[PDB]
Design a binder for this molecule. Structure first.
Ligand SMILES: [Zn+2]
Lengths: 21, 249, 50, 50, 50, 50, 207, 101, 218, 79, 51, 99, 231
């Protein structure tokens, strides 16, 4: 999601990418 | 205990050697903080050498992470016990359940920024109840070796120190058991043979005016490290072959 | 006893701590009812039924 | 935490205590809020000096 | 859904996690989506989506 | 640790800044100067905005 | 690299325009020119008069003033074009700092540059997660640049060059929309006319 | 474009020029960073690029003592052959070189 | 069994209307309770007189020919008028003034036991004519704050305080752990100065508390 | 203490040479050769020097003129 | 804070940020914000879309 | 099941009750989440990580402060040198790596 | 109407030997909270306490051993001793002597009674005894104080505490355990807003409630001594 400390593996393609806490 | 659990804590507590599981079921003859004596039932007992099952509980001793390991009896005097049953609780185990920490009350609310990122804000009731207090066992060592200038001594005879500061050392130079100590307190008196200080003129004038013998021996006595304090629970000594004892030895 | 930060919950995405909090609250409520039964000692019957 | 605090402070609900009243300024707003008479968020007109 | 000198109207929600998300204090749209709804789709070690 | 030396430490600390740094130093703001404030305990208190 | 001397006298610089990758603008010209020293004289499109000189630090006032005139091709001084030997002149660098004034004579700028690039390095990712025609967004005028055109049987202007570029010139004269049109595209319009917002200006087959 | 595919920055400089290659590098790294939403001014990459092109290979020695294929840093040959250009003697030609960091 | 035993230290900077005061050294936890108690008492319990309602010649929704200012705007201006009344419980004055200039708080009638601390207080200005403006005003005094919204009504701001806050921060004595330095900040409307206002509010507290304690000395 | 040095950066441009001139002044002060030009509110030589800078009464040129005068005073000490 | 620094300077902007942090923590405490199991919405349409 | 168990105790379905500030005594708006969480104290003790040193022992091969308990500053690496270089602080770095 | 009216203490209902509810009827607008929260503060913080401080045991050097003849470790025995409630009358510190033998639980009534000795829970478990011949003699030192005094901060003077047989324990000087205050509307004959203050406390029964609620307001008004006098 947000507040980048671990990445978000799960998303629709094209989103920048989280970078989630 | 875990107020919220899973059911696996029992297996982890039991199958780990930290607990004390009864070899054979029966009745507890004797319950002490030091040992537990269980009278075996005749069904589980072999025909010869009747006897009883004596479990010597491991008391306060040093662990690998400098923590403490201590077993406590969880049974009462004259109680029916089963085979494969917990007879004593090791550290962080409650009645055969694994208790890694403590269950306590928690409120999810920002409180004056004192819990900013993940920081925790704890009440004084917890530190007063002493429920999160920990016991550490530190093992300090003092080594009398064979320097080229001679052998090192453990005697309580020490230079450059007040007799009131050494009041806690015994006649041989080792602190008494149970004596509470703080940082800097001499645990074991020890001096290293030294010589040829080769001192300079001003010190020579000072020593000539005040007639003070400059001891030839350097201080290396084992003292408590900076910033830690506790009580002495056990002293032991290892001595070479037949080469003469300390008195405390 | 403790004041946690709710903000630490959504970013880190561990909702199991909230369920643990609620269920521990519930279990402690049960234990408080039981202790109330202990002090106002009724009998084996009411405690057993509860 | 401070961002949250300021977000909860500055905000408007459709209705609360004393919606649509008038005040001489911010000091009156503090007196109103701290005494519990007026809510933190409420659509109001106040005289302010910028 | 709230009532002010009238039957019904609706506004931006006062729900806690929604405030924490919108204010920018802690979280974003994705995390809130995953606390509530079905959670996307992952891939095998090859990278082939499930 | 006589009681008189604490006031001497007050004197020597007043206008004497100290430098604070974190392990992953990336930009120059990874090191910052602050004014010491004597605190009971063994933990450093860092201003949250930094 | 340090600020060895304030100036060197080089007139070389770089042109600055709002960046467009073939879609809409992804970063305004104000973000790219603010805090930098001009590299040339400043004129309106028709040389009305000199608005800004060649050495005024473009701070907020001058950024807004250029925003009023709206000319969007700005020659600005850069670090690479600096005439200074074994160092950088304070004018070609710019003004950026934690403080708002111009860079001081002596600050070590290369180390700060490296650290500024390094801090976002943590936010990046070592391995990635998994991965028909032009539709104008705003209202403006078609401007075909670097394009050969020919009228086909239907009359629609078709493109016979690969390097074709398409600009949207509004009523002020700025360029907010830039696109790259492939060879063999269909243009119901050409260079010179006016289109509506959202109106399809051109189509081609992507394959 | 005589063909397609990504391009090598050294040749980009060798054909288009200096400003073209620095613009390419700053724009590409700005795209890569902007995708993750990190604001970075172009100045830092400008100075990195200036230090990248610092070396250049002589082409003609002229009245200088340089070698025909020697690679010397731009500023040094710059000041030397610029003093020789202020002098009457013919200067030396060079070609900018792109060296990785 | 010893206790603190703090004494006060000497600060104020806005001459008469706004003053901040610092008290130390307090015991741990005493700063917050003292500040909160004195704050609630100074806010919701203070003898003071202000506008509750006012007679009008013109008419809360209307207009008056010859004044650009609006009705509830005038009411707002009314509420800020510092009124000090003697033993006379409920007094009523009259606004007798007309002309081409502003009607200040010195344009009101002068009764026997009435006092206004701000003659320059702006009630309402006048636009050009003989235009009719004249009215009477009744004032009540209360032991707290009451808006008229609960009941030409006017919010009644009785307590002379306009703002009050308290900042608790750690203090230190020569051997001490965590001691409370209570910093009070408060402003008034001009009737009674804040220095005596704190005293009389905590005196309301004392009178509220004087019943139980024995042997405060020794 | 001095929370912001911005004013000292204002009176002396080049916010570095402020540090150098103020270190020279604080060396003149700490090493007991001179005394403050502004009342010392129990501040160390650092903040005292900075307060001297803020009031626009100490910079490089004033200190240098003072040193060049002390040079000739010691030359007059030749007697 | 950006506009505050651009207008009034550094000296006020610092105390502005200090007071901002103070009041933010204070009123975030006063607000009593939290997170519960019911604070998470679950649309009933969810199962219809799944179906 | 959790709400059902809460019904056996006297505790709301939301798991959320009203709380009052211990300082001002007034209620907290916005019901909070209270309960009983099982927590552990990890063995990262502040009287184990806290270290300090002004002048201690020094290494023999190269004159550097690490010796013994940990001593010596948190090694002032190259990154911290760059952090000092970005600032206009030169004497700080000199006294750091020389004196 | 005019200032002022001051509430007074009304019926004090004792429910158990542990806790009880006190009540104050004539409160003005919102004064209930203003008084009750401050009373909660001063009650929880500052009250006379009589917690145990020093314990010298039969033949034990430190708290980390185990006496032969008791299944409780010495540390557990000290933790149990810390939770013993007692009240004194004319002394500020008193030393009790504890002796017991024979198999069975050693309750809090096995100590030697003295003049100011008032036990509140003679059934409180100190330890158990697991042998026919096992005797424990100890000197339990009790002092009177306030607040929470931990054992580490106790040793600054230290004044030759040489008898290592003496172990120090943490001080828990507090009679109060849990204080709650509820402000419900108290309708007098014809007052719209008067409010009733119900303070339900929690005590060890050591100090009677009226004494505690007296000394709380005592210290509260004593803090106002900056500008105060009796009227
Ligand atoms: Zn230049």
């Amino acid at each position: 999601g947000g507040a980048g400390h671990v990445p978000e593996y799960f998303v629709g393609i094209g989103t920048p990418i989280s970078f989630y806490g | 205990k875990p107020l919220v659990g899973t059911g696996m804590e029992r297996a982890v507590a039991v199958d780990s050697g930290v607990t004390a599981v009864a070899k054979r079921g029966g009745v507890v003859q004797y319950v002490d903080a030091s040992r537990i004596v269980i009278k075996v039932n005749e069904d589980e007992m072999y025909p010869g050498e009747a006897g009883i099952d004596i479990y010597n509980l491991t008391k306060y001793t040093r662990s690998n992470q400098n923590t403490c390991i201590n077993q406590m009896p969880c049974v009462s005097l004259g109680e029916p016990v089963e085979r494969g049953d917990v007879l004593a609780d090791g550290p962080s185990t409650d009645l055969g359940e694994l208790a890694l920490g403590q269950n306590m009350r928690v409120a999810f609310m920002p409180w004056n920024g004192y819990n900013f990122e993940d920081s925790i804000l704890v009440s004084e009731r917890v530190v007063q109840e002493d429920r999160f207090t920990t016991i550490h066992i530190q093992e300090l060592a003092c080594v009398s070796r064979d320097t080229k200038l001679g052998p090192e001594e453990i005697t309580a005879d020490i230079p450059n120190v007040g007799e009131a500061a050494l009041s806690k050392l015994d006649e041989s130079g080792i602190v008494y058991i149970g004596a509470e100590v703080t940082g800097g307190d001499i645990l074991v008196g020890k001096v290293t043979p030294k010589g040829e200080t080769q001192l300079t003129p001003e010190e020579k004038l000072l020593r000539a005016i005040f007639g003070e013998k400059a001891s030839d021996v350097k201080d290396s006595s084992l003292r408590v490290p900076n910033g830690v304090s506790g009580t002495v629970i056990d002293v032991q000594v290892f001595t070479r072959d037949g080469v003469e004892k300390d008195k405390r030895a | 006893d403790i004041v946690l930060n709710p903000l630490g919950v959504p970013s880190r995405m561990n909702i199991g701590q909230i369920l643990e909090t609620h269920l521990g609250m519930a279990a402690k409520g049960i234990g408080d009812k039981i202790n109330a039964m202990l002090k106002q000692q009724q009998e084996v019957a009411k405690l057993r039924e509860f | 935490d401070v961002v949250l605090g300021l977000y909860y402070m500055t905000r408007d609900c459709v209705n609360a205590k004393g919606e649509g009243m008038v005040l001489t300024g911010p000091k009156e707003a503090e007196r109103l809020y701290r005494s519990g008479l007026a809510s933190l968020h409420a659509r109001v007109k106040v005289r302010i000096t910028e | 859904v709230i009532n002010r000198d009238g039957q019904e109207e609706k506004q931006v929600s006062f729900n806690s996690i929604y405030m924490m998300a919108d204010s920018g204090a802690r979280g974003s749209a994705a995390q809130i989506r995953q606390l509530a709804g079905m959670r996307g789709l992952m891939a095998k070690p090859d990278g082939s989506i499930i | 640790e006589e009681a008189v030396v604490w006031d001497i430490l007050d004197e020597v600390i007043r206008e004497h800044p100290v430098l604070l740094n974190r392990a992953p130093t990336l930009h120059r703001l990874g090191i910052q100067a602050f004014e010491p404030v004597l605190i009971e305990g063994k933990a450093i208190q860092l201003h949250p905005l930094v | 690299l340090v600020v060895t001397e304030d100036d060197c006298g080089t007139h070389e610089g770089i042109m600055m325009t709002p960046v467009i990758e073939g879609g809409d603008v992804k970063e305004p010209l104000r973000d790219r020119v603010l805090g930098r020293v001009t590299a040339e004289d400043v004129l309106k499109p028709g040389t009305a008069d000199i608005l800004v000189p060649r050495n005024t630090l473009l701070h907020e006032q001058w950024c807004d003033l250029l925003e009023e005139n709206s000319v969007d091709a700005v020659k600005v001084r850069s670090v690479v074009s600096c005439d200074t030997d074994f160092g950088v002149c304070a004018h070609c660098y710019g003004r950026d700092l934690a403080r708002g004034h111009i860079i001081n004579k002596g600050e070590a700028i290369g180390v700060i540059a490296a650290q500024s690039i390094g801090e976002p390095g943590t936010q990046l990712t070592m391995r990635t997660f998994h991965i028909s025609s032009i539709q104008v967004k705003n209202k403006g005028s078609i401007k075909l640049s670097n394009v050969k055109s020919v009228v086909n049987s239907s009359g629609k202007l078709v493109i016979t060059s690969r390097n074709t570029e398409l600009k949207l010139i509004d009523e002020f004269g700025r360029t907010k929309e830039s696109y790259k049109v492939p060879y063999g595209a269909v243009l119901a319009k050409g260079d010179g006319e006016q289109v509506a917002g959202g109106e399809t200006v051109a189509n081609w087959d992507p394959h | 474009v005589i063909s397609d595919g990504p391009e090598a920055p050294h040749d980009i400089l060798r054909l288009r020029g200096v400003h073209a290659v620095t613009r390419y590098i700053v724009n590409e790294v700005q795209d890569v960073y902007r995708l993750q939403g990190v604001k970075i001014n172009d100045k830092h990459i400008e100075v990195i690029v200036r230090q990248m092109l610092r070396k250049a290979t002589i082409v003609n020695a002229g009245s200088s003592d340089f070698l025909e294929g020697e690679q010397v840093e731009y500023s040094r040959v710059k000041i030397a052959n610029r003093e020789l250009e202020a002098n009457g003697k013919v200067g030396a030609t060079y070609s900018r070189d792109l060296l990785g960091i | 069994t010893e206790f603190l035993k703090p004494r006060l230290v000497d600060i104020e900077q806005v001459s008469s209307t706004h003053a901040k005061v610092t008290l130390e050294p307090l015991e741990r936890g005493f700063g917050h309770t003292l500040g909160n108690a004195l704050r609630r008492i100074l806010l919701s319990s203070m003898p003071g007189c202000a506008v509750t309602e006012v007679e009008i010649d013109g008419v809360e929704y209307s207009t008056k020919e010859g004044v650009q200012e609006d009705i509830l705007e005038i009411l707002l201006n009314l509420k800020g008028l510092a009124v000090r009344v003697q033993g006379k419980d409920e007094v009523i004055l009259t606004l007798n003034k007309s002309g081409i200039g502003p009607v200040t708080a010195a344009d009101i009638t002068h009764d026997g036991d009435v006092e206004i601390v701000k003659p320059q207080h702006v009630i309402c200005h006048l636009t050009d004519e003989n235009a009719s403006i004249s009215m009477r005003i009744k004032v009540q005094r209360g032991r707290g704050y009451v808006p008229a919204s609960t009941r030409l009504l006017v919010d009644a701001c009785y307590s002379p305080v306009e703002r009050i806050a308290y900042n608790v921060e750690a203090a230190r004595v020569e051997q001490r752990t965590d001691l409370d330095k209570l910093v009070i900040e408060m402003e008034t409307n001009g009737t009674i100065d804040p220095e005596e206002a704190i005293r009389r509010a905590a005196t309301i507290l004392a009178e509220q508390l004087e019943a139980f304690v024995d042997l405060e000395v020794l | 203490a001095r929370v912001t040095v911005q004013d000292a950066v204002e009176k002396i441009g080049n916010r570095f040479d402020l540090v150098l001139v103020a270190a020279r002044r604080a060396r003149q002060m700490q090493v007991g050769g001179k005394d403050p030009l502004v009342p010392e509110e129990n501040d160390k030589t650092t903040v005292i020097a900075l307060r001297e800078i803020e009031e626009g009464l100490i910079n490089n040129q004033i200190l240098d003129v003072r040193e060049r005068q002390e040079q000739q005073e010691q030359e007059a000490a030749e007697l | 804070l950006n506009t505050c620094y651009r207008i009034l300077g550094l000296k006020p902007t610092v105390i502005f940020a200090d007071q901002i942090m103070y009041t933010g923590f204070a009123y975030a405490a006063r607000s009593g914000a939290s997170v519960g199991i019911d604070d998470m919405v679950i649309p009933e349409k969810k199962h219809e879309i799944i179906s | 099941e959790i709400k059902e168990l809460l019904k056996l105790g006297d505790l709301p379905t939301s798991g959320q009750i009203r709380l009052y500030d211990g300082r001002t005594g007034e209620q907290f708006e916005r019901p909070v989440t209270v309960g009983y969480m099982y927590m552990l104290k990890l063995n990262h003790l502040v009287d184990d990580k806290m270290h300090a040193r002004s002048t201690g022992s020094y290494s023999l091969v190269t004159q550097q402060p690490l010796g013994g308990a940990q001593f010596g500053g948190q090694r002032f690496g190259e990154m911290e040198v760059w952090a000092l270089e970005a600032y206009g602080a030169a004497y700080t770095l000199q006294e750091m790596l020389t004196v």
